[PDB]
């Protein structure tokens, strides 16, 4: 019952029923003219001040949540790419917040990088607040995917021709490398934005995952999490499970 654990539990419980959007930021493997662009082919560290700051935040979040009782053998390249994607994902969120003139302190958000059995690396984002309404979900997904595709093409470390960069840009948009949670439906039928409950989803689902500590990553494990209150960022796996237990 450290202050950190109690603090996170209290913060989430107060936001238990806050409606938010659920996004997933991802990428897919691409071959363009014989050039392989994989999940970790985006390792340029762009020297933009805010991005640099965000990447430092991800590094230190990893460092403080590392359990050293147990050894951690995650590939350094994998760690680097996840830190970079953390900075790029948040850059996308913040760019759209700016478009809507939303004060970042009026926003609740949660970010968690995971490794799926099938899709590999992806990043869950929960985001919402007083300036958010359900009908805006599709616009948000489209805008986030514009910025995500733009930043990925800038961060790509594969030598691409201009034609190849534009092709990659359109692939990332056309194939929806940012997804939005919707209610299950038919292909023809409309899809409605499905808002989720912020505190509940974090405590009862995201904080229950197992920490990736090896390469290749455990199926369904998480790398790293963070939130708008810096509450879950530094928690070790055991502490995260304690938060779920206390939340109940
Ligand atoms: Cu996932």
Please give the full DSSP string across 153-165, using - where no structure is assigned: HHH--S---HHHH
- φ/ψ of residue 184, rounded to 5: -55, 145
C-alpha radius of gyration, the chain, whole number: 18
**Spatial separation of the C-alpha atoms in residues 226 and 164, rounded to whole Å:** 33
- φ/ψ of residue 217, rounded to 5: -60, 145
Residues noted as catalytic: 205
Per-residue exposure over 169-178, b if at least 16 CB sit within 10 Å of its own CB, e if not = bebbbeeebb
Q: Tell how far the Cα of 103 is from the centroid of ligand 1, in angstroms.
A: 28
**Residue 135 tokens, joined:** 């009908």
Pairing of strands 120-129, 35-37: unpaired
Which residues, in sequence order, are CB contacts of 235 under 8 Å at separation 6+? 4, 5, 8, 65, 225, 243
Q: How many CB atoms lie within 10 A of CB 203?
A: 25
* Cα dihedral 155, 36, 32, 156 in deg (nearest 10): 0
Residue 60 · residue 230 · CB < 8 Å: no
Q: Which experiment gave this structure?
A: X-ray
Q: Tell how far the Cα of 149 is from the centroid of ligand 1, in angstroms.
A: 20
Burial group, residue 248, by CB count within 10 angstroms (0-12, 13-18, 19+): exposed
Q: Tell how far the Cα of 26 is from the centroid of ligand 1, in angstroms.
A: 10
Q: Which of 17, 18, 4 is nearest to 127 (CA)?
A: 18
Question: What angle (nearest 5°) sits at the alpha carbon of residue 210, between those of residues 52 and 151?
Answer: 30
176 belongs to an annotated ligand binding site: no
Which residues, in sequence order, are CB contacts of 69 under 8 Å at separation 6+? none
Using DSSP's 3-state secondary structure scheme, residue 215 falls into: coil
**Spatial separation of the C-alpha atoms in residues 128 and 228, rounded to whole Å:** 11
Residue 65 · residue 234 · CB < 8 Å: yes
């Amino acid at each position: 019952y450290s202050d950190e654990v109690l603090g996170a539990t209290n913060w989430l419980k107060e936001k238990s029923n806050q409606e938010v959007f659920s996004f997933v930021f991802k990428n897919e493997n691409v071959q363009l003219n014989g050039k392989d662009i994989g999940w970790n082919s985006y390792k340029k560290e762009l020297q933009e001040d805010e991005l640099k700051s965000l990447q430092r935040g991800a590094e230190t979040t990893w460092d403080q949540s590392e359990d050293m009782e147990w050894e951690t053998t995650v590939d350094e390249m994998t760690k680097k790419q996840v830190f970079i994607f953390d900075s790029l994902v948040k850059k996308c969120l913040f760019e759209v917040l700016n478009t809507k003139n939303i004060f970042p302190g009026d926003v609740n958000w949660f970010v968690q990088h995971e490794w799926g059995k099938d899709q590999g690396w992806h990043c869950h984002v929960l985001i919402g607040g007083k300036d958010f309404s359900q009908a805006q979900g599709k616009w948000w997904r489209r805008q986030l995917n514009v910025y995500w595709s733009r930043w990925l093409v800038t961060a790509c470390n594969v030598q691409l021709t201009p034609a190849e960069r534009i092709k990659l840009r359109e692939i990332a948009e056309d194939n929806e490398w940012v997804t939005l949670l919707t209610y299950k439906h038919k292909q023809t039928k409309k899809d409605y934005t499905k808002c989720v409950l912020f505190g509940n989803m974090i405590a009862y689902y995201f904080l229950t995952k197992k920490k990736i500590s090896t390469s290749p990553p455990r199926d369904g494990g998480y790398f790293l999490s963070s939130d708008s209150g810096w509450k879950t960022n530094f928690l070790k796996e055991g502490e995260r499970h304690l938060v779920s237990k206390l939340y109940t």
